[PDB]
């Protein structure tokens, strides 16, 4: 069985300011080439005043044009960023307002699976489409990580960049092969503490003096995160590909990963031909929720993924969750 | 109609009752001010609890109520109006809290501010009817009390803490549970009329340009009301047009999100009192937990029975409107 599903248009926004790793290396006394070797990052983009809703709206406008549509044709907006612009309201109504659709009534909501929100939003969208509830759905991921960096830790502040990307999804028309062949999501909440920001909510509120600045930074336990993979990834991979026994990785053109560090790409490059891998981290850094849809944009707009080609979206994110999808574009 | 069954319901009520009379004494408010102006006699405030703890207690009750074990749940959707913390989201946190941290059971968040529960029900209904998942837990837990602005009586007397949850499934053959009509509209031009500017990249907590005020709720009541004056009649018509053979007269209960007495006051001018489910007097505005708490009370205390029709409805920050007509 395959599920009809079309990525009808794609869009991106990247901030103008290119922050070279060499520049970060001089200012914070790191060795020349440290970022490239340790993080796999030559450069990243950082905002200089724009909001996350602004970035998302710019990406969305490109996606809507790319799909041959007007903004008034969109009948549902799903905001799918890795981090919020602000606490209230959610990213949905904020990007709806930014797009000039603030009086349209067009439903605008958020789907949140931390840095894997884009994937889960596509899934939610695919069900709305196949239930015929909505017809033309905007999915928008925009993240600004540069304002939350921990400059105590080079592993942190050299890692993150800012970006947005977006997709419009529809049901395919007759003669279009666009579809999902397999999809899988697993969550291992025992890993929550191994990639966590304790602040940003009711647990450690910003105005509470019981809160400490460090609560507002990301803490990771790399060793323990990797163990979740050692324990559960082979099973995850098997369950996914189980779903489409007539399709193997040999049949797909591109593997399109969420890429929060060089480790995922290094692992994939040991396993799969390099030509199949979509790389964006070296130029955009870890852009949280925007990483996977930026890689998708790259695959289509820079690397020639064509309609009828097969590809795989895949990723691991805070939670800890695993996602994968095998699809015909 | 869309097959859809509320298989089990659960709640968590923090122990501490915070009397309006006490808030009025401590903060120099007239006696009876909260009840007259806010419709609130008391609310519950947490002591040690995390949002995940509250959600897990409500979930356990909902899963038991549905005749299930926790191991039977195949998707968790966290649907609170406020987050426990920035990373990870509420789903993995309540999954861990429930002892399912090594289960693999997918756990995600649906966020439509204080209307998250409604939108999570919708998302769940589509997963169910697509046959992707069979037994979906929806959990709404909010702790508002730690974010109150004690400069503003309209703020700090309004909010309380609570959790509620549902397990949803497809009905069995012969069972009449279904959704007859459902509608959601968003008017993002209203974003600034109910807003917290902090809590993210726009006004990061550690930034020197972020002020304490950025982390408090700001509301413009006059402008919020105008959104209703302009768009609510159209919303209501659009909802009920989906189910011509059903009118409000066929409905046993109207079950509203209750962010202030204004919504109840509006409904009570319009509809028989006996149809309204009220919780604000005892819980205050508990954000995302309000609607599912009212749903819990409709079933468990006011005797909504299988086959009865009801309406879930609400207005939330955004600004969005939601409504659903269903057979329980
Ligand atoms: Cl609708
Ligand atoms: Na009193
Ligand atoms: Na929303």
Residue numbers in the entry:
A (entry chain B): 7 to 335
B (entry chain A): 8 to 335
Paper text:
Using in vitro assays we show that MxnB catalyzes a unique condensation reaction forming the α-pyrone ring of myxopyronins from two activated acyl chains in form of their β-keto intermediates. BLAST search results identified MxnB as a homolog of FabH, a β-ketoacyl-[acyl carrier protein (ACP)] synthase III (KAS III), highlighted by the presence of the archetypical cysteine–histidine–asparagine (CHN) catalytic triad.
The crystals contained one biological dimer in the asymmetric unit and the refined model includes residues 8–335 in chain A and 7–335 in chain B. The MxnB monomer displays the overall typical ketosynthase fold consisting of a five-layered core structure, α-β-α-β-α, similar to that of thiolase I.24 Although the sequence identity of MxnB to E. coli FabH is low (29%), pairwise alignment of the structures gives a Cα rmsd of just 1.5 Å over 254 (monomer) and 2.1 Å over 508 (dimer) residues, respectively. The active site of MxnB contains the catalytic CHN triad (C121, H264 and N292). The active site C121 is oxidized to cysteine sulfinic acid, but this modification appears to be either transient or a result of crystallization/data collection, since LC-MS analysis of the intact protein showed the expected mass for MxnB with unmodified cysteines. In MxnB the catalytic C121 is located at a crossroads between two substrate-binding tunnels. The first, canonical, tunnel (red) and the second (blue) tunnel, positioned as proposed for OleA, have amphipathic character (based on electrostatic surface potential maps generated in ccp4mg28). The position of the catalytic C121 in relation to both tunnel entrances strongly suggests that binding of substrate in the blue tunnel and its subsequent transacylation from the CP to MxnB C121 results in the obstruction of the red tunnel entrance. Therefore, we propose that binding of substrate in the red tunnel would have to precede binding in the blue tunnel. In agreement with the biochemical data, we propose that the western chain is preferentially delivered to and/or bound in the red tunnel, while the eastern chain is preferentially supplied via the blue tunnel.
